[PDB]
Amino acid sequence: MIQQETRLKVADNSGAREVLTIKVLGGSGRKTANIGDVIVCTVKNATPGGVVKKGDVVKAVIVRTKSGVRRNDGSYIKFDENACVIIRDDKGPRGTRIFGPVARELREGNFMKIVSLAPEVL
Amino acid sequence: YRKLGRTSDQRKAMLRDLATSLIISERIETTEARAKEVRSVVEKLITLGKKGDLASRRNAAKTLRNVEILDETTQTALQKLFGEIAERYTERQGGYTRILKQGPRRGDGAESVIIELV
Amino acid sequence: AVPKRRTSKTRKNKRRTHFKISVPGMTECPNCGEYKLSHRVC
Amino acid sequence: TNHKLIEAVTKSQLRTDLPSFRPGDTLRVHVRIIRERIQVFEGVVIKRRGGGVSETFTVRKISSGVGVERTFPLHTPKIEKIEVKRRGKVRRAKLYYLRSLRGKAARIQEI
Amino acid sequence: TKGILGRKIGMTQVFGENGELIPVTVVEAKENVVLQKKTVEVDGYNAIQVGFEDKKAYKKDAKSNKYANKPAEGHAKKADAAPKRFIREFRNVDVDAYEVGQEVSVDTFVAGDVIDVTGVSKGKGFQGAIKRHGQSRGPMSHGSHFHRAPGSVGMASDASRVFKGQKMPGRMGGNTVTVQNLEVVQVDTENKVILVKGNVPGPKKGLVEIRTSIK
RNA sequence: UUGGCACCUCGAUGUCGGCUCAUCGCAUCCUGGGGCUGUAGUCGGUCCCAAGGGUUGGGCUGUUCGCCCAUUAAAGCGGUACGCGAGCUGGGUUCAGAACGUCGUGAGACAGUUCGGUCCCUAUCCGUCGUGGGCGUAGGAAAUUUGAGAGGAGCUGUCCUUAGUACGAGAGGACCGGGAUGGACAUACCUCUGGUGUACCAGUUGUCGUGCCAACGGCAUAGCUGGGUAGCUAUGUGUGGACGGGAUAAGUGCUGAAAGCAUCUAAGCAUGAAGCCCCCCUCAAGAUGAGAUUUCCCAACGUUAUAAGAUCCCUCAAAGAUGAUGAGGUUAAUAGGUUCGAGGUGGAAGCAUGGUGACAUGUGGAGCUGACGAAUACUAAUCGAUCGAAGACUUAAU
RNA sequence: UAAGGAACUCGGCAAAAUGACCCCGUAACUUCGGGAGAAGGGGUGCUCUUAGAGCCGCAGUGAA
Ligand SMILES: CC[C@H]1OC(=O)[C@@](C)(F)C(=O)[C@H](C)[C@@H](O[C@@H]2O[C@H](C)C[C@H](N(C)C)[C@H]2O)[C@](C)(OC)C[C@@H](C)C(=O)[C@H](C)[C@H]2N(CCCCn3cc(-c4cccc(N)c4)nn3)C(=O)O[C@]12C
Ligand SMILES: [K+]
Ligand SMILES: [K+]
Ligand SMILES: [Mg+2]
Ligand SMILES: [Mg+2]
Ligand SMILES: [Mg+2]
Ligand SMILES: [Mg+2]
Ligand SMILES: [Mg+2]
Ligand SMILES: [Mg+2]
Ligand SMILES: [Mg+2]
Ligand SMILES: [Mg+2]
Ligand SMILES: [Mg+2]
Ligand SMILES: [Mg+2]
Ligand SMILES: [Mg+2]
Ligand SMILES: [Mg+2]
Ligand SMILES: [Mg+2]
Ligand SMILES: [Mg+2]
Ligand SMILES: [Mg+2]
Ligand SMILES: [Mg+2]
Ligand SMILES: [Mg+2]
Ligand SMILES: [Mg+2]
Ligand SMILES: [Mg+2]
Ligand SMILES: [Mg+2]
Ligand SMILES: [Mg+2]
Ligand SMILES: [Mg+2]
Ligand SMILES: [Mg+2]
Ligand SMILES: [Mg+2]
Ligand SMILES: [Mg+2]
Ligand SMILES: [Mg+2]
Ligand SMILES: [Mg+2]
Ligand SMILES: [Mg+2]
Ligand SMILES: [Mg+2]
Ligand SMILES: [Zn+2]
């Protein structure tokens, strides 16, 4: 459950460490976003030498949330943190690695490169 | 359950007081709502007495007040409950109390009732 | 906050149409030949 | 019970091959994922709740340093098998205190 | 089309084909009987009257609705049925396919049928604009003295009145509500139960009317 | 709008912005329909019809406004005392303090600025939202209803396919259709995920009690802490609005004269919008025009007693401020108790064993358990009392 | 009080958070006194032996 001003860890090696959510995309009046949704964010904290730098306005896909998600079989998955991945327009990751587990809903979202690079897909 | 115009602790204390008073006197006059709550409290205490084991006695002592009852003998309310009252109700399956309405009080119009052991 | 006009006698009595009490619910007691409230004991 | 009609109409949905387990136990849950494969979720049971066909249980694991929790209805056909690997020693029904712990501080003693 | 009356028992869930969780409402629709057939020639419209949940027979000095009064008893005897607790009319069905006194069984519906369910929603008593009409609160701090009030109720000299239809506090719930395009999940002839996908209006034990969906 | 005028108000018509809640207009921002185009296509420009619905979250500023960030189908313009302070706020602006610049000999002052600075009111009438009582509806009554009329709802994105087809050197890339899935909104509901859960379970601190050990009770925010049933709930679970029929707008015509021809028009005949009337949901016969159907009841002398039927009173909850509604009142499961359960907690007390001891283990998924399910008349719904029609007249009738 | 965490607002107003004792450790600047409780970190229960060994809970200045 990600809204404007929510801060998210970045689960890739693109340079960004923490981002702040600027906008939840996908319609007028949309307030919250979850796993697989795309957000506009600003990089509040970055590591040295990364492609993505502090102060940049980028787009990211949410890959895990504390709220988690509910699947049609009545099962749920929840994570210990909110983490996102910086993406390009082609939905490919800007970084070259993905850290930590990501939700399988990314596959339905067509973030196949992220799913492939993830060390675990639950 | 009713709130009886009291906070939780006050209500619990009043219910313990009323139940012990009913055990001591076998018949008391109070308000209707008070009696409608006291009946459940007192009947559960009598159930504990009919059980009669040490655990049931200690559970009853959780609720009963420490009031002595004076043939110049002396016994506590818990003793009376686990002796005389339990023995009198050994063969009855619930319904140990009955409420009898009497009409409003002069001072505040409260519906006075008498609740007594059957 | 305050009445704009005084209330007429007519309006006051119309309002008081329902302001009354009812005779209590009472039944005869057999032995004593008196009356009591229904579902109450002497 | 619950309502007799509800119990009667949902009796057929209940499974009779699930092992007994309690919170604090480690389970391997073999979940069918679909190309139909089985993915094993191994972790500690932190909560069981509800009753009848509505009963659910939650299992928690640490995946690459990130806590993950999976909640399943007890009688979902999507679970192939449940194996009780370990029998933990706990003092309460809901192990929510494990969420804020990490490493050895999150260890659960065995029976 | 098709129609039946029942009592809402409660909510539960089932597992469908491919294992998806289907939340369902259990409706007990036993003891449904056609009491009357209204026609255009006599009543001016076509409908079937269905009674549901047999009640006790008439007795002298009955003090509650548990016992049929003499008008209700005569109405039921005309159909050769026991007096019923709930009586409702169905205009959607075709009256030429029913006889007076015939049972309306749960087997009338079939799994997969699309239905509309009507019932009286749960009562909530006197409620304010925030809950009843879903309005916004005023600020809870910053000196505010406006929290759950309804707000301005009109304009100035024009119009010097509050319009009809203004949203204000008042009794909430207890209204007839129709939920449309639900699905029948399962029909269980024994126990006379219909499982409706989703949820329906009203408290447990409340009367519900199941009809074939208009749309 | 800035003004002009000075006609209501100075025995008071509270001023800006914001919040809450809207409501109306159309010179239409989006969506729907259409003409022209310097309209190849995708996009645009302009004009006409169209007010059904929709029309944002932030940074700065008291701000309105405006600029900017990021969205969106779109972020329309106006009216309602520049809507709305007996609904709120009070940052700004007519107050007493103080200071700067400036003007003044001065007291003080300001096309200025700066820090600080009390927002009263128990609703009589109309109005509005709910909810009862009386009478009427030509007998009385129970239930089921028709629908005059009224209210609600009315939005829209993206993707796939048609089709990489039509068009186009190329780049690019359709209409018309057909499928899928969302955003916002509305509504119902607690199976699920969670919240709450002050008479549920457990752990724990200080202190005072129950004579002591043990076990418990009081108080400390429910002392605190970890869970949690019902109920109530959203952030949770379902459902709804892109349909169709009739009549139309701007348009487009067919046939067709006045006017030999031409011409959508003058008479005729079609077609044509998210708009109109229906379709969908809700209320509705005080619809005094008071409707309909089925069933029940039937007296004598205004009076007495009554019928069918209601109530009073009492036990209550799915209902509820109170009335009202619904479940029941002994020919009874309505509530309480009792017994058995579901769920919740998580292993009672006592005793035994092990340990120096704090403790541990076993008896034993134990003990306890508000609201949830069932069974059971043990307790209380006693006796009783009140109301309640007797069916008018006139005219026609196969 | 889920998720979020000043997006509220003129303004974090109000509330939340901090808080005791013991031990580590502490910057610019300075009128050399200060700044300073700067900041930031560790330990508190119970039992037994004479600093060790144990015991229990989600939590030990377990409340205020
Ligand atoms: C809080 C109560 C006071 O209300 C108000 O102060 C306000 C908030 F209601 C208020 O300011 C009203 C609104 C005022 O009226 C406005 O006047 C404007 C000029 C015009 C406007 N309209 C016509 C456009 C009017 O509505 C005025 C003049 O009160 C000062 C009304 C007149 C009749 C007036 O003087 C009245 C009598 C005024 N007052 C003097 C207080 C004088 C100041 N004060 C004294 C105290 C106090 C005294 C003792 C103890 C304590 N603890 C406090 N608190 N405040 C009182 O003792 O009581 C009230 C009612
Ligand atoms: K729930
Ligand atoms: K009528
Ligand atoms: Mg009470
Ligand atoms: Mg207390
Ligand atoms: Mg359980
Ligand atoms: Mg708000
Ligand atoms: Mg307040
Ligand atoms: Mg002017
Ligand atoms: Mg003049
Ligand atoms: Mg004036
Ligand atoms: Mg005046
Ligand atoms: Mg126009
Ligand atoms: Mg800021
Ligand atoms: Mg104004
Ligand atoms: Mg006003
Ligand atoms: Mg001054
Ligand atoms: Mg000078
Ligand atoms: Mg200040
Ligand atoms: Mg109509
Ligand atoms: Mg439940
Ligand atoms: Mg719950
Ligand atoms: Mg002791
Ligand atoms: Mg004391
Ligand atoms: Mg004291
Ligand atoms: Mg919170
Ligand atoms: Mg939280
Ligand atoms: Mg934070
Ligand atoms: Mg802000
Ligand atoms: Mg703001
Ligand atoms: Mg403060
Ligand atoms: Mg302290
Ligand atoms: Zn008497």
Cβ pair D6:E26 closer than 8 A: yes
Q: How far apart are CA D80 and CA D4, in angstroms?
A: 29
Contact call for residues A120 and A101 (beta carbons, < 8 A): yes
- Label residues B67-92 b or e (16+ Cβ within 10 Å = b): eeeeeeeeeebbebbbeebbeebeee
Q: How far apart are CA D62 and CA D68, in angstroms?
A: 6
DSSP letter string, C1-42: ---SSPPPHHHHHHHGGG-------EEEETTTTEEEETT---
Contact call for residues E13 and E23 (beta carbons, < 8 A): yes
Q: How far apart are CA A8 and CA B2, in angstroms?
A: 49
Residue type, C32: C
Chain C: partners with 3+ C-beta pairs within 8 Å:
B
Task: Tell me which residue range forms the domain holding A66.
Answer: 1-122
**CB nearest to E15's CB, from D9, D52, D77:** D77
B2-118: in CATH 3.40.50.620:
no
Question: What is the DSSP secondary structure assignment for residue B1, as one 8-state letter?
Answer: -
* Distant-in-sequence, close-in-space partners of D60: CB < 8 Å, separation ≥ 6: D43, D44, D46, D67, D68, D69, D70, D98, D99
> Residue E27: which of E47, E42, E44, E10 has the closest Cα?
E10
Q: Is the CB of A4 under 7 A from strand G?
A: yes
Q: Is the CB of A3 under 7 A from strand G?
A: yes
Q: How was this structure determined?
A: cryo-EM
Which chain A residue shows the shortest CA-CA distance from E18? Answer: A73
Task: Tell me which residue range forms the domain holding D28.
Answer: 1-106
> Residue A15: which of A45, A60, A57 has the closest Cα?
A45
Tell me the chain A residues in contact with residue E20 when contact means C-beta distances shorter than 8 Å. Answer: 72-74
Cα dihedral D93, D96, D97, D99 sign: positive
Q: How far is the CA of C36 from the centre of ligand 4 (A)?
A: 27
CA of A22 to C1' of F19 (A): 25
Task: Tell me which residue range forms the domain holding E141.
Answer: 1-215
Residue type, B115: I
Query: How distant is the Cα of D37 from the closest Cα of chain E, in angstroms?
Result: 14
A75 token code pair: 């099962």
A26 token code pair: 């996908």
> Residue B100: which of B39, B46, B12, B45 has the closest Cα?
B39
Q: How far apart are CA E192 and CA E29, in angstroms?
A: 6
Q: Is D52 helix (H, G, I), strand (E, B) or coil?
A: helix
Q: Report how far Cα D46 is from the mean position of its chain's Cα atoms.
A: 8
Q: What is the 3-state secondary structure (H, E, C) of B75-101?
A: EEHHHHHHHHHHHHCCCCCCCCEEEEE
Domain locations along chain B: 2-118
* Distant-in-sequence, close-in-space partners of D102: CB < 8 Å, separation ≥ 6: D62
Q: Is A52 helix (H, G, I), strand (E, B) or coil?
A: coil
> Residue D56: which of B84, A75, E81 has the closest Cα?
A75
Radius of gyration from C-alpha coordinates of chain B: 15
> Residue E80: which of E33, E29, E30 has the closest Cα?
E33
Residue type, E118: T
Cβ pair D10:E12 closer than 8 A: yes
Q: Is A81 helix (H, G, I), strand (E, B) or coil?
A: coil
Is B103 near chain C, with CB under 8 Å? Answer: yes
**Residue A92, domain CATH:** 2.40.150.20
A–D touching, 3+ CB–CB pairs within 8 Å: yes
Starting from the CA of residue E144, give the closest ligand: 8
Neighbours of A42 (CB within 10 A): 15
Contact call for residues E140 and E191 (beta carbons, < 8 A): no
Q: How far apart are CA E181 and CA E111, in angstroms?
A: 14
Q: How far apart are CA A24 and CA A22, in angstroms?
A: 7
* Distant-in-sequence, close-in-space partners of B86: CB < 8 Å, separation ≥ 6: B46, B49, B50, B52
Question: Going along chain B, which residue ranges are E strands?
Answer: 27-31, 68-69, 75-76, 97-104, 111-117
Contact call for residues A87 and A60 (beta carbons, < 8 A): yes
Helices (H) and strands (E) in chain B, counts: 5, 5
Q: How many domains does chain E have?
A: 1
Q: How far apart are CA B40 and CA B101, in angstroms?
A: 17
Cα dihedral A99, A102, A107, A109 sign: negative
Which H helix or E strand runs over E66?
none
Question: Going along A1-122, which residue ranges are E strands?
Answer: 7-10, 16-24, 38-46, 57-64, 69-70, 76-79, 83-87, 101-102, 120-121
CA of D93 to C1' of F42 (A): 64
How many Cβ pairs within 8 Å bridge chains A and D?
A: 53
C23 token code pair: 């005779």
Which residues 70-89 in chain B have a CB closer than 7 A to strand F? none
Q: How many domains does chain A have?
A: 1
Greatest pairwise CA separation for chain B in angstroms: 45
Q: How many domains does chain D have?
A: 1
Q: What are phi and psi of C23, to 5 degrees?
A: -60, 135
Q: Is the CB of E143 under 7 A from strand G?
A: yes
